[PDB]
Design a protein around this ligand. Structure first.
Ligand SMILES: Nc1nc2c(ncn2[C@@H]2O[C@H](COP(=O)(O)OP(=O)(O)OP(=O)(O)O)[C@@H](O)[C@H]2O)c(=O)[nH]1
Ligand SMILES: [Mg+2]
Lengths: 84, 77, 852, 98, 74, 73, 235
RNA sequence: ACUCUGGUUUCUCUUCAGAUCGCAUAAAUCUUUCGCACUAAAGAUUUCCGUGGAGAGGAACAACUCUGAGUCCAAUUUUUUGAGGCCUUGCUUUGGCAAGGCUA
């Protein structure tokens, strides 16, 4: 009644390797440490593909969830209990 | 640990030369003498001025109510 | 997959996928005292994660305790692993490998087999009984096995429904329990960063009878789901511990307002819990539906017709919901096992973290070199095949994959205790069903089929054709000493092989079981007590060998000590007549045997730190302290081998030529001993002189090992030898009136009462006593019969004390079937053991000399 | 909000005294309205109703938008429309010519 | 019901903020609100012209903040 | 809000604010229109199909959902 | 409201009714809060003792279930060598019932008794003018003596909130009675039940199932033991 | 927050019930074991006392409590906008797309 299913799947994706695209086209693949009700994602050990194609290694990242276009989660969470 | 609107209150207590950046407008920033804020970070500036980066012709604005939905960054001097 | 598993809240594909991500795994041992709520807590977690598995109304489903002797005795006997997927307070599902360990202190070894494969501990404490014997012993063994310790104060309903304490005074009870656990952890650990408080989330409060389980965060989240705008973690920071609530300023203060206000725990947590339990048990018919409406709980009309205990369990299952405070506590405060891999490898791996394989085991990666470690062997109920249970610390076991099992005697130079075994099947072991898997990645627990043959107690499974420098994990250092000794023969000797087969099987099932054959052909089982050996004997006669087996009387293993230095400096030449060794044996300093046994010293140290210890602690010269060769029968045994050979009289390189064989003979001599072939204890063996032969085919090996044993024996016997009794520390939980009855029961059995102290907040007393373990046979039966069941005792091994007799006393006549008096008990204890051993009738001090 | 009352008609004190009152005028005056909206378009019509998000129902609208060629201004006539109100820049009562 | 962004991991840390219009900034975090406006000590501006501009204590609106990178090890 | 509970597990096409297409199995949604789509293939223009997996699409960037195919077995 | 109907098959009772019925039946019930009292005196203990041809002292005595090993017919092996046996205390009958696999050669048809159940520390309430939740003087006192957040921190509890059942009293006038009904013997721990025949209710079965009291003559003691004998033969 | 089930009691029948079918406990018979069988044990069968469930049939009064189902949010974080306009190439399906630079 209060919290939705996709934020439960986002909380279920913590510890896993998620790849989050942001509003400025930058793709961040790495270990999602923590995520909140708003989609503020503290992630770590991040491989970053910018818009040009350059890849950087940013070891501790906190993305503001407003700017997140989407996150690609592991398909393990296709069997997560809140997706039933 | 400093919370931000406390430092805005300290800014107006200092009446600093607050330069405010803009959302999505990277060219034009605004100098000012900050007087008042609110719950939603609307800012009134006493002698506010537009500064470009290509033009850099500082235009004086007077006391403005710059909306909270437009600011990015409140630096000093 | 491919098996018929029960209906569960999660699904097994998600469990098998949480197995891969080893950040979402918690290897947890639920350990505590006897009957402190661990099996019922696992029952509550199983009922949470399995909708079709439900506890009966009048009788608790255990769901571990899957043995017949566990179901009949009511005492947990073996550790049952349960792998569930439990959701957290934030809703995040973590894989939980839970070891439900027996809380009976005799089965403490079983807890050690769970403590090895765990990264954390939930110590279960009865809120009524408080901290008991095995809770102190498992605090000690949990912070000494380098495990993160959390506390579940189970049975808080006994504060409400039994003691009927006021909520302030039951808060004082829970606070006293948390303070007692903090004092025990500060006692057994120099670090004070592992303070246990419910403010930190380290302490959970529970009632596994009624499915109450909350930390402060999970009780604060009930407020956060009832009232929206509150952030529950900041609230949980204020709920416990002399913080009062000001409802006019709406703020939590340390200063008490009104001079009769309650703490935040009493106001916000304990009084709602009391009002829930009091409205259920007292006012079901009158005023339960309006308070249930106030709590948001609606029960069906069929559900309100329940009796008061199932209705309590149901009301608190609807109020508290899932056991997310347990998952809060074990996720915030028990490592990852990715984080917990490095203390596990530093503590339990023999190569240490600094090895090339210790690094790759600290990384805990499933695509690494396979380094599984099994501590438990679980028999299938046909009794024939065992399944080795343990955790994968690196790599991935696969079903059908050939594998290299290393036993406990595998060193890298003695590579013969290994065997290449084909792994048959892999199971994720929940208690009453096994999820058959194709592979098990690192960090996870696994039942392995097919590796059971080359191992007895403890294995390191590696892979063949790689990991050539793979060492074993350390054997299970047990909490206690298997002391009670029973002889075991078949009724019909023709079915001796079945019994021998069964003896091997109980050696696999019970981790601190010692099955040996003495020189008389007598088969001997060592156990920790009479319940332990009763279950061993049940499994021996019923599970493994289906034959009839005579048991002897329970006896104890004795130790052997000296009380003064040896009279003449004893010597022994080899059968070559070269290589004379000349030793004296003197008693160790007080507390030194406790220091060698509890690893306060090691011979694995360098000579500088070891000599510095023995100089600064026991007034040894650095001449003597730099001359320590070995440490008793094992590397941590209560004897010391020193050489006081001056380098003037002895060539020191020629002495280091045979240091290994003299050490081997000394270790074998202290392992058997000349009085009754039972371990020498607390004896310093000083090599005074050593002639050594010059060429190496005249010294070494078959000459100097038995010669060193003979000079250890003669140096021991010329010092005045005493037998040592094992003493059981007995913690009796009696009523206040039965204390003088406990004293009376102990006075008939040579037991000295250390203390009789009131359990604070309970009407019971704890009588702590020291009985001899030879006098503890039927002591708990004597106590519970004499007190009409009101007193109850748990007795565990504490120390060895010198028997009041003198064992080398031929002046003493012993009529064979009489209880001897104290001043010649040692003379009874020495020769009967010698008869049991079958050695000669008496040992003379001149048996191992060269003069006769 | 420090006004949590159930009987909230302050939102049309807003529509009689405040800034959005300009459109309740064209609810009552039935006046033609020019709307400068976000895709550089102009919507002239007559708003029948609206409230606090400035979403308006407009009747008989001429909408103007100019194209590049360098700009020629095109037109299309629409019967009657719902307009989501964050999709405006400015709203204008069309002036008194007389 | 606006929970604060979970940033005591990042207190007193050297972070590089990305701001909205392709912009960038560096500095020490000193606090936040539930709206993720950040207050920053030792702020170096670091524009795309390439020359690094120190300011000091600044406040950044949380609307404009794309990402935090903790340059210091948390 | 049963108008999209009618569409759960249907293979849906989600046109986004940049113009990218998300053809994924519509698993879940919430009040903010954040979608959980599994086995989601991105379609962009020059045609190419880019498999992603379990996409948690934030609701800010979703324009329009439409069904591509019936739910699988 | 209180029974099934005219067939008189199921009853459901209010807990004041069960409390006052428990008080009216106080003389027929032993006020044990445990089955620890029946340690080595329960049915399993007696099944064990019957199977081992041993008699628990307060308990029954049967014919031997198996033909006994005559310990003057066994012929001094190395196992039963009495010169090897350390005697400290006589290994009683009770020890062979308590641990039937440790202390018996050939434990056949033997029953592992229940071990300790944890001591139900239930304080019976003598005074109803006392609160139901009350620090009774049977309870040993708790001698008094924390990462607390500062009072300067701005955590406020919001206006709607207070503890969960603040209007509810902590105890009522029938709370201690219901707590006493939790530790009441069967049928008084029930509040619903199925109706039993008057034949089927032995009013004094849990009397000979206790130990026979002190100071009793020999005929009532053998009567207790033979009532136990036919109780155990029935079960 | 509007509508359609289901009731409860009692009498009887039929079938299943190794579940404490019974929080109680009988008797008979057979077999075995020792005594030398009320004062004795085991195993098995049977009968009784008399249960639970399901199904069915009657007849008494209740009919929508219960078990279900059908039936107040524009100010950062999502849904009341940083939106729209210019320049080069690859192809133009000559509509324009894609990438980048911009300007606001
Ligand atoms: N009053 C009360 N009793 C409980 C509670 N939890 C369990 N018990 C009872 O206490 C006894 C403890 O048994 P278990 O919990 O199964 O045993 P254990 O704690 O795992 O300890 P082990 O016997 O060594 O395995 C059981 O008979 C339960 O009925 C509780 O929360 N409150
Ligand atoms: Mg247990």
């Amino acid at each position: 009644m209060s919290i939705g299913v996709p934020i439960k799947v986002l909380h279920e994706a913590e510890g896993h390797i998620v790849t989050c695209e942001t509003n400025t086209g930058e793709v961040y693949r790495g270990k999602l440490i923590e995520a909140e009700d708003n989609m503020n994602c503290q992630m770590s050990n991040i491989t970053v593909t910018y818009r040009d194609g350059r890849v950087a290694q940013l070891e501790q990242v906190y993305i503001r969830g407003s700017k997140i276009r989407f996150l690609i989660l592991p398909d393990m969470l296709k069997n997560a209990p809140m997706l039933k | 640990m400093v919370q931000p609107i406390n430092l805005i209150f300290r800014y107006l207590q200092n009446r600093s030369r607050i330069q405010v950046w803009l959302y999505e407008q990277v060219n034009m920033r605004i100098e000012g003498c900050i007087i008042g804020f609110d719950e939603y970070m609307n800012l009134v500036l006493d002698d506010a001025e537009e500064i470009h980066s290509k033009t850099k012709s500082r235009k004086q604005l007077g006391r403005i109510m710059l909306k909270g939905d437009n600011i990015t960054l409140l630096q000093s001097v | 997959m491919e098996q018929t598993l029960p209906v569960t809240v999660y699904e097994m594909d998600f469990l098998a996928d949480l197995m891969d991500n080893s950040e979402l795994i918690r290897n947890v041992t639920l350990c505590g005292h006897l009957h402190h709520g661990k099996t019922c807590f696992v029952d509550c977690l199983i009922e949470q994660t399995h909708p079709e598995i439900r506890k009966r109304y009048d009788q608790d489903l255990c769901y571990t305790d899957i043995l017949f002797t566990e179901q009949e005795r009511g005492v947990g006997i073996k550790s049952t692993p349960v792998t569930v997927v439990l959701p957290d307070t934030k809703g995040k599902s973590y894989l939980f490998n839970i070891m439900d360990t027996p809380g009976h202190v005799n089965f403490s070894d079983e807890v050690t087999a769970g403590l090895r494969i765990s990264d954390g501990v939930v110590l279960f404490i009865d809120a009524a009984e408080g901290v008991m014997l095995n809770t102190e012993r498992l605090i000690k063994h949990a912070v000494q096995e380098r495990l993160a310790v959390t506390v579940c104060i189970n049975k808080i309903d006994r504060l409400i429904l039994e003691l009927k304490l006021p909520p302030t005074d039951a808060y004082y009870k829970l606070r006293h329990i948390v303070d007692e656990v903090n004092g025990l952890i500060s006692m057994y650990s120099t670090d004070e960063n592992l303070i246990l408080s419910p403010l930190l989330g380290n302490v959970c409060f529970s009632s596994s009878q009624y499915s109450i389980c909350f930390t402060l965060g999970s009780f604060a989240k009930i407020y956060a789901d009832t009232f929206g705008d509150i952030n529950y973690q900041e609230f949980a920071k204020r709920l416990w511990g002399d913080i009062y609530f000001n409802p006019k300023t709406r703020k939590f203060t340390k200063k008490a307002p009104t001079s009769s206000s309650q703490r935040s725990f009493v106001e916000f947590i304990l009084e709602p819990l009391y009002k829930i339990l009091a409205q259920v048990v007292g006012d079901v018919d009158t005023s339960l539906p309006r308070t249930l409406d106030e709590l948001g709980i609606h029960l069906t009309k069929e559900e309100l017709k329940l009796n008061i205990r199932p209705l309590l369990r149901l009301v608190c299952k609807k109020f508290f919901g899932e056991f997310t405070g347990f998952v809060d506590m074990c996720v915030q405060h028990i490592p990852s096992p990715k984080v917990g891999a490095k203390p596990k490898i530093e503590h339990t791996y023999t190569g240490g973290v600094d090895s090339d394989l210790g690094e790759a085991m600290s990384d805990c990666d499933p695509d690494g070199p396979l380094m599984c470690h099994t501590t438990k062997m679980y028999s299938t109920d046909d009794g024939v095949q065992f399944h080795a249970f343990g955790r994968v610390l690196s790599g991935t076991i696969h079903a059908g994959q050939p594998v290299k099992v290393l036993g406990e005697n595998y060193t890298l130079e003695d590579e013969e205790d290994s065997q290449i075994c084909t792994v048959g099947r892999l199971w994720i072991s929940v208690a009453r069903y096994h999820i058959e898997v194709n592979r098990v990645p690192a960090g996870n627990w696994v039942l392995i089929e097919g590796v059971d043959q080359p191992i007895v107690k403890t294995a390191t499974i590696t892979e063949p054709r790689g990991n050539e420098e793979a060492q074993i994990f350390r054997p299970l250092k047990f909490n206690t000493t298997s002391v009670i000794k029973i002889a075991v023969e078949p009724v019909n000797p023709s079915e001796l092989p079945k019994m021998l087969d069964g003896l091997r099987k109980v050696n696999k099932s019970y981790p601190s079981l010692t099955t040996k054959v003495e020189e008389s052909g007598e088969h001997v089982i060592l156990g920790t007590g009479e319940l332990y050996l009763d279950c061993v004997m049940h499994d021996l006669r019923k599970m493994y060998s289906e034959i009839d087996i005579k048991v002897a009387d329970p006896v104890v293993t004795f130790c052997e000590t000296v009380v003064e230095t040896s009279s003449l400096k004893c010597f022994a030449e080899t059968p070559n007549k070269k290589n004379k060794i000349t030793m004296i044996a003197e008693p160790l300093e007080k507390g030194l045997a406790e220091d060698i046994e509890n690893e306060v010293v090691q011979i694995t140290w360098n000579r500088k730190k070891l000599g510095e210890f023995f100089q600064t602690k026991y007034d040894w010269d650095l001449l003597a302290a730099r001359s320590i060769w070995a440490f008793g029968p094992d590397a941590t045994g209560p004897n010391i081998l020193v050489d006081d050979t001056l380098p003037s009289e002895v060539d020191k390189a020629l002495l280091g030529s045979v240091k290994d064989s003299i050490v081997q003979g000394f270790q074998w001599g202290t392992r058997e001993g000349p009085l009754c072939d039972e371990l020498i204890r607390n004896v310093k063996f000083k090599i005074l002189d050593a002639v050594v032969a010059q060429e190496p085919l005249h010294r070494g090996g078959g000459q100097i090992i038995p010669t060193a044993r003979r000079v250890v024996y003669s140096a021991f016997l010329m010092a005045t030898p005493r037998l040592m009794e094992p003493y059981y520390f007995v913690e009796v939980q009696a009523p206040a009136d039965c204390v003088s009855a406990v004293y009376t029961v102990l006075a008939r059995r040579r037991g000295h009462v250390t203390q009789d102290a009131p359990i604070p907040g309970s009407p019971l007393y704890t009588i702590k006593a020291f009985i001899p373990a030879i006098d503890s046979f039927g002591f708990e039966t004597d106590l519970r019969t004499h007190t009409q069941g009101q007193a109850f005792s748990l007795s565990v091994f504490h120390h060895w004390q010198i028997v009041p007799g003198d064992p080398l006393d031929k002046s003493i006549v012993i009529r064979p079937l009489e209880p001897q008096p104290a001043p010649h008990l040692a003379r009874e204890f020495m020769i009967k053991t010698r008869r049991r051993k079958g050695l000669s009738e008496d040992v003379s001090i001149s048996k191992f000399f060269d003069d006769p | 909000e420090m006004t949590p009352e159930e009987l909230q008609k302050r939102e049309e004190e807003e529509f009689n005294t405040g800034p959005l009152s300009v459109l309740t005028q064209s609810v009552k005056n039935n006046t033609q309205v020019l709307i400068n909206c976000r895709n550089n378009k102009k919507l002239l019509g007559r708003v029948k109703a609206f409230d606090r998000h400035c979403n308006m129902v407009l009747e008989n609208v001429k909408e103007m938008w100019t194209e590049v060629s360098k700009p020629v201004n095109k037109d299309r006539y629409i019967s009657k429309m719902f307009l989501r109100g964050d999709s405006v820049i400015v709203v204008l009562r069309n002036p008194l010519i007389a | 019901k606006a929970h604060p962004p979970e940033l005591k991991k990042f207190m007193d840390k050297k972070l590089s903020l990305k701001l909205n219009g392709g912009r960038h900034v560096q500095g020490i975090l000193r606090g936040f609100d539930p709206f993720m406006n950040l207050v920053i000590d030792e702020c170096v501006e670091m524009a795309t012209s390439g020359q690094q501009n120190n300011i000091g204590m600044v406040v950044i609106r949380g609307n404009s903040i794309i990402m935090l990178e903790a340059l210091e090890r948390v | 809000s049963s108008k999209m509970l009618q569409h759960i597990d249907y293979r849906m096409r989600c046109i986004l604010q940049d113009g990218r297409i998300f053809i994924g199995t519509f698993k879940a949604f919430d009040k903010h229109m954040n979608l959980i789509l599994c086995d989601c293939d991105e379609f962009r223009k020059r045609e190419e199909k880019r498999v992603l997996g379990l996409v948690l699409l934030r609701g800010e960037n979703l324009v329009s959902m439409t069904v591509e195919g019936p739910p699988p077995k | 409201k209180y029974v099934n109907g005219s067939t008189y098959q199921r009853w459901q009772f209010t807990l004041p009714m069960m409390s006052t019925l428990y008080r009216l039946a106080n003389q027929l019930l032993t006020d044990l809060v445990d089955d620890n009292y029946f340690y080595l005196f329960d049915l399993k203990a007696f099944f064990t003792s019957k199977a081992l041809n041993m008699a628990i002292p307060g308990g029954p005595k049967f014919e031997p279930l198996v033909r006994d090993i005559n310990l003057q017919d066994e012929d001094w092996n190395e196992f039963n060598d009495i010169n090897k046996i350390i005697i400290r205390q006589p290994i009683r009958t009770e020890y062979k019932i308590a641990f039937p696999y440790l202390y018996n050669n050939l434990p056949h048809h033997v029953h592992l008794t229940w071990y300790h159940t944890p001591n139900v520390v239930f304080i019976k309430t003598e005074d109803p003018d006392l609160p139901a939740f009350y620090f009774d003087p049977l309870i040993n006192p708790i001698s008094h003596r924390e990462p607390l957040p500062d009072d300067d921190e701005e955590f406020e509890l919001p206006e709607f909130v207070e503890p969960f059942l603040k209007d509810t009293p902590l105890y009522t006038d029938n709370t201690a009675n219901g707590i006493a009904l939790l530790w009441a013997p069967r049928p008084f721990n029930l509040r619903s039940g199925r109706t039993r025949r008057a034949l089927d209710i032995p009013l004094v079965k849990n009397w000979y199932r206790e130990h026979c009291p002190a100071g009793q003559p020999v005929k009532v003691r053998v009567s207790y033991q033979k009532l136990l004998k036919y109780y155990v033969l029935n079960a």
